[PDB]
């Protein structure tokens with residue numbers, strides 16, 4: 001691990017535990033001694049580009065990586081600014097931002113629970129139609145809130161939706177720094193998420209772009225894996241509608257809503273979050 005140790009201090013903040021360590025940043029549970037509250041701290045830390053120094057600052061693994069490291073840092077800042085525009089229970093709440101240690105940090109609300117990806121891996125039996133229908137209203141609300149301010153998410157999958165102990169969802173992360181690094185470094189595999197990204201993200205984007213990815217999330221919850229990669233579908237569409245597969249315990253209404261969100265062409269999908277929510281009515 002390249003993480004800061006329990007007990008490390010950023011003035012009033014104290015690191016408690018590194019709870020997420022990925023290729024592009026680290027997430028810590030931390031404590032604010034001034035306000036006496038637990039928070040999360042997200043640290044930009046692209047492991048392909050940077051390493052942890054002895055004094056716990058971050059340094060370049062090679063001098064050739066500097067421009068890409070800086071571009072990722074700029075995208076990390078821009079993502080924090082985007083999340084700072086909102087005060088919504090389903091969107092990661094940003095408390096503070098600062099630069100230190102040769103990198104950057106976001107202080108955010110600390111959420112209970114774990115990711116949807118972990119819940120699906122660890123407790124798939126909890127995820128049935130009734131649970132999905134309880135998840136959708138607050139998840140629709142969070143996504144629509146982004147859209148109504150004129151933005152798109154563009155990185156939805158199971159990996160970046162937190163499911164709190166209350167079962168309410170939170171969108172944690174838009175992948176901005178990761179995607180910028182991938183574009184600049186020709187590491188195309190870290191930009192789009194295979195099976196979640198629709199055809200128009202491969203090179204015309206709008207709310208329907210996020211709606212497809214949400215359909216892919218729901219498809220994964222229902223049958224256990226995402227639909228075929230959208231570029232492959234654009235050549236020979238091998239997607240079998242869920243209404244035909246008929247997984248046990250799922251209504252045609254929910255299944256058809258997923259199939260419609262997964263329509264190959266943007267114009268054939270629900271065009272807004274409100275339109276997709278309407279498909280689940282009439283039951």
Ligand SMILES: Nc1ncnc2c1ncn2[C@@H]1O[C@H](COP(=O)(O)OP(=O)(O)OP(=O)(O)O)[C@@H](O)[C@H]1O
Pocket residue numbers: 019020021022023025027040092108109110111112113114115118162172
């Ligand atoms: N604000 C937050 N509050 C609480 N937990 C958070 C917050 N932000 C991120 N997390 C957690 O950070 C982790 C980020 O996942 P990541 O893949 O980067 O790390 P990981 O160590 O591989 O963890 P995992 O086994 O969950 O994949 C997730 O487990 C997620 O729940």
Ligand SMILES: [Mg+2]
Pocket residue numbers: 021022
């Ligand atoms: Mg992980």
